[PDB]
Symmetry: C5
Subunit: 365 residues, 5 copies
């Protein structure tokens, strides 16, 4: 992704004007190849009309250009563009909201499952690995950058996400479906076996663990559904025959005709259509928002970095459930042990952020 | 459904332009018969005006065409179209969000309900069948492709979704209502009988199972409500009068009149209305989005494939609760048993996805 | 309600065109009386201008009609209409989402509360009646068709929804407020009395029942709030002044003036304003959507049928908790007892719905 | 609030037309003082132009009026008005959705907490008073009509909402913050003391009570946040410099100039701007929706009546937890004791509401 | 933040007009530097055209100004502005909705964890400090005003939010990631140690505490995600090109040309563009809403005051869990001990707020 939050913290004179000089993941990079084609077509038509066409055909071209001018309307195109990229943006955010994080699960696995020895460490590590395996399995079927990293299920065994026995057992199901639901069923059976044996104290804690697992299952299912069902092709094909039948009209009709005929609209010849290039930029960078956000798991500059979250999770979970169990800092008296109103100091550079407490909107009256 | 997610992963030069050459489930297939009628009417009127009408009646037709030209406005038509297909799209997505999946229920049935023998296997299989039966019963009343597959309740018995005893019992209720609520009541009684007998350990687990069943009941009820209550006919009949009273005005008024009268607008005769055909495509493919999404359980190309999810569920649930109970892969030491920061390898084709961890937006300052 | 879902399943040639010939609950019935008034006023003014007015006053009328022609604008009227009926539609759907159904409660009452004899049957029937009573009490205060059916609280006693003792006790509260909250308090006390006595096994089950009751209480409160607080009168009176100050301008200004003055816009006299009648239909059927959905508990054709859901619930609940307790079909071996991949047959008429399982969007690459 | 739901139940001929003759809480009352100023300014300018100005200055005024006529545009003003009052309306509804009602708490306090004597009655009454106290304390800091009723914390003691001991204890905290969070902490300690002593049977019930209290705490916090943070002043100041720079242009520019100069637009002199007054009404009653809903806890006619809900709650809760505990109507056999399909009678005035049960949309096919 | 709720409680004559004379956090302060540049450029171009340019070049400038006048359109610019600041505003509100408050956690920590001595006080204080530490750690990585207050982790130790032992232990993890997830794992282990030892009575209460902690973990994660992923740069750069390519057209084209050429539009020379300055204000104060709300954790006048909520929380939590445990006011008989319908008095200034109870919308009929 592209992060520019630190550059727009305050509304200064040039906060938004300085973002127009950005190259990576911007308008100038996304619509660089669609501008050359437009310019080449425009100048080819201009040259053909200026020298190739004869005097009699010049009048026909002039009348055709006059005709192809009442069809340049900006309301219908600005409506589809804008009712389309609100749905696209909402889908883009909801796709990120469903990314699984084992943060509410590693806490409970570290706490509830007891025992500080082997067969406790092994059990906790297996329990926390069975969820990262499911997350990797679902992400491999939707993310191109992750599929490139793990092109086959033997690569998972090589990378340590799997085990030889697990890989052998996963192949003995015989079902012609995606196998991203199997580790979630392994987790429940292993947790029940752990409970039968005195490692989990209570059925209350066991039910809490099951409830935590079901949410991750639901989130993975939602990601799979979003990938499977996309915005209908009839809706997608309407916005690109609304923005491609507008610059086509512009090409023949936004042409500097001969100024000897004294038209009410055309009386000056500029070489470059400065006010048409700006319209092209504004009306194409709006469509390239949808063209980029319609699948957030690609290899763009504004696509989710899924190869980093499956690396952070593997380290954080294994450190939380193995090396940080029953190991907490010493318990000591605080600084404000006998103070009823603690007053932490303010630094010199942040003395202007001091404020009084809000006490209701009717306090003054 | 039509899946094109793999073709729009990246925003390249021709990602959206190459989707305009698609036939299955597209504009060219949906409005293929509504274009021939328009063309035939246009050309019939043109021929009649050109030869059938006399000189005196030509002036009347010309004045009528001039009159039928100030009523071609694009804002009121672009507002209803756009405030209608946002409601239609939201309803279309919410209808899929309520599809029942027994994924959170097969896990708990496989885990909690104990016993590895007959009368345990039978109990688990019956418990998991009583939910697929309810899902099939609700889908048969709303999906045309499923009703065609199971036209009568004897077909369910033949297909194995039901049993002779259950089919005989379901007919002895005598209520003139839909019977999609009965298996959910059978499930609770069977689960209570299982608890009374030592197959379920705790009332906590029993309550968890009941809580899981109630959610599926709510989702089935929501699907039934969505099917029962549709968008009001007065709202549907308004958008069909605003897009049919626009091409009617176009037919008489977007006609190439005689160029010997020297009108300010019409001075050239083209045979084919190229810029009217494009408007027709853009303004009719927008209405055919609603025309297609107003009932997602039909036999279109962009309608939910409900005949595949009732086949996947039956296999997956029965494999999870019967052949995968108390059968988990061996417990073994991991690859990173004594490593605090695991570093899974990167493939050669995905070495450009390496990134540093994000450490807050205030890190640099 | 009006159901037309079966007629719009597929996007065929005449799916939306055939709905324009519907009478019940449609435009032609909702704005039948508002069209006669408009036509009568238009023709009266036309006749007065054509014969009553003198030659000198004809010029004044002509100038007034010219003046009342620049105020016919379509954007401001199409904005309020469209930002109003999105709020109206969302409120209309949220009002249905809060309808209480005792489907998650009859299941638990049938399962948890034990005992197959008198004093068990009586207890279960009373527990399930105390919720239908509250639903009827809340619906009687907001639905006209239900108030007409039960104009007084003695009618509830006559109809069997109540009892003489309960009716006598409810009158002995002495509070000048609505009494739709009393059965919910009776339910909790009766359930606690049932638990004290061995009819409910566990406090876990008791708490589950209380949690189920609280949701119905919340839904009834939400229905009461929606009925109590309506869309502000200032917002409602603004859309009624924007659509009544537009046809008023149309009446004087969309008139076929004398064609002897050679105006740039008016040069032909048609008897009937065909393109004004269509505008009237389109701009009045849009307001009559809000006029119909602003209170969904009336006696319209697109209003909720509340008299049927209080009849279905009474039968279904009493059959579930009384005659279907501890009575389930025999437990038998399934058809696919020793088959790992069941393959239910496909009928001849639905052989085109066979599809392969989706296996991720990265499978081909 | 203003309730007109009973007058718009059905879509008859004059349902919406009869609401234009309402005075209380309407357009004519909200914008009564802004119309006199506009009329006075318009007529003063008209008189000055007609008599005070000389012949040479009349031409300058005429040219200025012509210039101030191309800036009367209706799209930019109809966009901000309409994107502002959607946010205002959603905030207005979400502010009511967070009003605390102790209906789910009085039920559980009446049921779970046992004992029918003193020290049980006292405990239940104190527990139910500790929540109404918190609701009153939060409402007093945001509602003007409630602050006027309880201007000081001694008024709460006088009115019975508090006690001398509690008022003395609340003053001994020494924190310079709002004290609307203290009764919620008193509730938990009192409930734990009640459990330690045998008045609450189970820790399950104790946890249920704590869960119920936390929701009310969250709702009160949300109300406080909504009051504290308002719509940004820059957003508010943009809509009122876009509707005040439109009637300013109207004042000089919608003036009936001298008809002796033969302008294409102005050729007739009417005394009163009938079509400008209507525009003023439509464009000012739209802004006065936001002006009224931007703070729903004022003293308007469309503002929440918070002084009645703190009076209903105090009576209902104290009747439920004190006089209605372990006191339920006699248990008797129902009317349909041995009937499987009860058929409640239909009244003569509601015989047209009889309908058949819906049996799926695929039943006919 | 800026609070003006007390000034807009009622819809009086000058409620919204008096907010146009506000300086702090307003239009005049936010766009003060962008107005001087525009004025300087306008007057420089005007002077150059009036004196520097020759007679022949004046005609070229005049024709260029005429050309740059058909590209001043208001619909495309009013659509992006308005579809952008709805997403920005929704994100701004959702960012505040995720602010952690330990209000539901201090209650349970004060109630459930028993013991009134040392090793009970110490345990409760540590448990409540471990959550404020996590909140401070997450806020320090996203808020500039908090980072300025705590530029290093030794400042936290100095300010009392931390301890030497905890600071030493946190440095011994060796993970190159943000460490805002560590106190949440310390909390669970400390709570389990407290349970093992008789300080927490029940596993039910322990599970309740874990459930309460998980919600705060989720909220902190959501804040981190919102900070990490921002609105795409292509979407931000499109609205900035559409409002900077409009005043550029205004500069050359909204110029008072020579009135000796008798143009249909320009016939008068005013020194100051009064109707262009207002347009600039309206169309730039709309963009400065997004420029200000795109990062609500800056140092603006309409940005969240995060330095006050980390000071209020530290005092409130430590007072609730330490000095207010098992210390509640005396239990006494209420004022309405033997009254069934309490009637609290009304003050003289609020006697107009008396209202009758609402009894349904069908009461009158
Ligand atoms: Ca992409
Ligand atoms: Ca369909
Ligand atoms: Ca109605
Ligand atoms: Ca107000
Ligand atoms: Ca900011
Ligand atoms: Cl999380
Ligand atoms: Cl150009
Ligand atoms: Cl699921
Ligand atoms: Cl054409
Ligand atoms: Cl339900
Ligand atoms: Cl007409
Ligand atoms: Cl409630
Ligand atoms: Cl006027
Ligand atoms: Cl809170
Ligand atoms: Cl100007």
């Amino acid at each position: 992704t592209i992060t520019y939050t630190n550059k727009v913290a305050n509304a200064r004179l040039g906060s938004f004007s300085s973002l127009l000089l950005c190259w990576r993941g911007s308008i100038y990079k996304l619509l660089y190849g669609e501008f050359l084609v437009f310019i080449f077509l425009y100048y080819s038509i201009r040259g053909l009309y200026r020298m190739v066409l004869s005097s009699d055909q010049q009048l026909l071209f002039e009348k055709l250009a006059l005709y192809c001018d009442s069809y340049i309307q900006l309301i219908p195109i600005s409506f589809v563009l804008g009712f389309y990229v609100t749905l696209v943006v909402s889908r883009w955010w909801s796709q990120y909201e469903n990314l699984p994080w084992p943060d509410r699960l590693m806490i409970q696995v570290s706490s509830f499952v007891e025992g500080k020895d082997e067969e406790g460490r092994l059990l906790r590590r297996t329990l926390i690995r069975y969820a990262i395996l499911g997350q990797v399995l679902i992400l491999r079927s939707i993310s191109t950058s992750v599929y490139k990293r793990f092109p086959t299920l033997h690569h998972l065994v090589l990378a340590g996400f799997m085990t030889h026995g697990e890989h052998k057992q996963l192949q003995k199901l015989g079902l012609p479906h995606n196998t991203f639901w199997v580790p979630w069923v392994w987790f429940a059976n292993l947790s029940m076996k752990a409970y039968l044996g005195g490692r989990i104290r209570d059925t209350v804690l066991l039910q809490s663990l099951m409830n935590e697992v079901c949410t991750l299952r639901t989130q993975c299912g939602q990601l799979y559904a979003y990938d499977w069902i996309s915005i209908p092709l009839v809706y997608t094909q309407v916005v690109t025959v609304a923005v491609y039948s507008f610059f086509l009209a512009c090409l023949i009709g936004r042409q500097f005709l001969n100024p000897n005929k004294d038209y009410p609209g055309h009386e000056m010849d500029l070489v470059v259509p400065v006010f048409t290039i700006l319209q092209f930029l504004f009306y194409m960078g709006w469509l390239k928002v949808a063209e980029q956000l319609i699948n957030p798991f690609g290899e763009d500059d504004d696509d989710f970095e899924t190869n980093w979250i499956i690396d952070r999770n593997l380290q954080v979970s294994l450190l939380s459930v193995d090396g940080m169990h029953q190991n907490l800092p010493p318990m000591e008296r605080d600084m404000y042990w006998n103070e009823a109103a603690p007053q932490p100091p303010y630094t010199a550079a942040s003395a202007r952020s001091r404020r009084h407490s809000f006490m209701g909107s009717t306090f003054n009256i």
